[PDB]
């Protein structure tokens, strides 16, 4: 019977890998979702027996494959998988209740009794820690890994020491297959955690602690999109320290290795603003405008799972062509090239109003300046250019479509 279940497991793993390598956008997802429901059913068949010491090695391996494949396809975790892990652990305990923390404590004591399933448990710890690192539970993560290693390592409240100290136990001998293994997960953990620690310390204003963790990103698994982002992040660090020539190094490296050169050209615009190189700043933003016109996953836990979405305050925030064309025209108008600024503003405003047919140009939300303020900046640029009739038409249009902005409308209408 274990024979058949094991075979089924192996078959499905191999099917998944085949879809991973080969296949179209459609056929890939087809075979994946097929293997997925195979694994579900197998889980349920195994979940239909009492305990079974010899089954757990599979159950844990299979739930691992299930979680991995589920998460990979969804391109994110959920809490369903938390409860899947909870179920498997309840099962491990039932062999020999409250919450994940006590469960794990009792489970890892029951592992120091030496049931030979550690190569799965450690994998499962990897997966648990991936959930808690996506859901920001870093204190409980620390506690789990402290319990895993000697609790003598209790004061080591650094994760990025515990995660290195954490040793997967075997070479993973002839057991059931897997889409991933303890080390292949630990190596994603170290890089994702260190990357996140780095970005937090940067935004929080310690670009002296950052450089340590942002080099620990590149010294271990680092898919090349993870390295581009590590380099923009170091450009930011050095600009904040007052070393613009070193920041330029890392941003040039990010330009070269990346197919994603938004976050570096933005860091460059901020750098030329810091120095005063305003012509260069406006050229870097022109190139960013041109860069945001131009635009695959794996059935396996990558590192682009365990990153957050960027904050607005982060160096890795890039807006839309529209948001950034406004930054260009704003930053052009403050500098005093009203002609260029006005040209940019009309090519902005047409993109927002004349756009009914094409895909809708991105519109600023609460953080973004209100539409009428944009009409006002446009009319001001127009006036500075000496395009008074066009400023009049703008203001007339605004008032025809619809306070301070009205009084100001009349003001600019006058100056026109």
């Amino acid at each position: 019977c274990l024979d058949l279940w094991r075979e089924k497991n192996d078959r499905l793993v191999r099917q998944a890998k085949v879809a991973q390598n080969s296949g179209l956008t459609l056929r890939r997802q087809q075979l994946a979702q097929d293997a997925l429901e195979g694994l579900r059913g197998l889980l349920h068949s195994l979940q239909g027996l009492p305990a079974a010491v010899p089954v757990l090695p599979l159950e844990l391996t299979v739930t691992c494959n299930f979680i991995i494949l589920r998460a990979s396809l969804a391109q994110g975790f959920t809490e369903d998988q938390a409860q899947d892990i909870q179920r498997s652990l309840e099962r491990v305990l039932e062999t020999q209740e409250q919450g994940l923390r006590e469960l794990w404590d009792s489970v890892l004591r029951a592992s120091c009794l030496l049931p030979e399933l550690l190569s799965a448990l450690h994998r499962l710890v990897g997966l648990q820690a991936a959930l808690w690192l996506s859901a920001d539970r870093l204190g409980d993560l620390a506690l789990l890994l402290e319990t895993l290693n000697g609790s003598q390592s209790g004061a080591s409240k650094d994760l990025l020491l515990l995660l290195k100290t954490w040793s997967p136990p075997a070479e993973e001998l002839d057991a059931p297959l897997t889409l991933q293994d303890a080390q292949g997960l630990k190596d994603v953990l170290l890089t994702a955690f260190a990357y996140r620690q780095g970005l937090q310390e940067l935004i929080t204003g310690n670009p002296d602690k950052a450089l340590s963790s942002l080099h620990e990103a590149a010294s271990g698994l680092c898919p090349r999109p993870v390295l581009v982002q590590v380099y923009t992040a170091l450009g930011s660090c050095h600009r904040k320290m007052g070393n613009p020539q070193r920041a330029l190094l890392y941003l040039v490296a990010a330009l070269k290795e990346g197919s994603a050169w938004g976050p570096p050209l933005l860091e460059a615009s901020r750098l030329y603003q810091q120095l005063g190189d305003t012509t260069a700043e406006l050229e870097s933003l022109e190139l960013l405008v041109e860069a945001l016109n131009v635009p695959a996953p794996q059935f396996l836990i990558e590192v682009e799972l365990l990153l957050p979405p960027p904050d607005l305050a982060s160096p890795l925030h890039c807006g839309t062509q529209s948001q950034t064309k406004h930054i260009l025209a704003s930053r052009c108008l403050q500098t005093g090239r009203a002609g260029d600024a006005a040209e940019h503003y009309l090519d902005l405003l047409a993109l927002l109003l004349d756009s009914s047919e094409p895909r809708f140009s991105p519109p600023p939300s609460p953080p973004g300046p209100c539409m009428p303020e944009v009409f006002l900046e446009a009319a001001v640029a127009l006036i500075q250019a000496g395009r008074a009739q066009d400023a009049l038409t703008l203001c007339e249009e605004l008032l025809s479509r619809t306070p301070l902005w009205v009084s100001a409308t009349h003001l600019l209408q006058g100056q026109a």
């Binding site: 019977c1 058949l4 059913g41 349920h44 068949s45």
Partner: protein, 88 residues
């Protein structure tokens, strides 16, 4: 039981079982294949409905006065009625 064949003195039965754990199982020579998971708790009995060309259903009753019709071919819930004083 669904079917009985006789290879030698021994013999070979395809038999459906169901469990405390809300599961429905197929067997061929005691080879478990095609497990389903039932919605409701504490199933009681199962009967078989033919209903045309190949649309064979196992109709499961429960002590909870409710009942499922799961496919054969794909051990997979097709309907889940409730309160069901009786089933025929």
């Amino acid at each position: 039981i669904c079917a009985t064949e006789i290879i030698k003195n021994q013999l070979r039965i395809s038999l459906i079982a169901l469990t405390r754990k809300n599961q429905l199982i197929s067997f061929q020579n005691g080879t478990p294949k095609n497990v389903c998971q039932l919605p409701f708790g504490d199933p009681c009995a199962v009967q078989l409905m033919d209903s045309g060309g190949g649309n064979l259903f196992f109709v499961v009753s429960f002590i909870s006065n409710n009942a499922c019709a799961v496919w054969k071919e794909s051990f997979q819930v097709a309907a889940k009625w409730e309160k069901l004083s009786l089933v025929l």
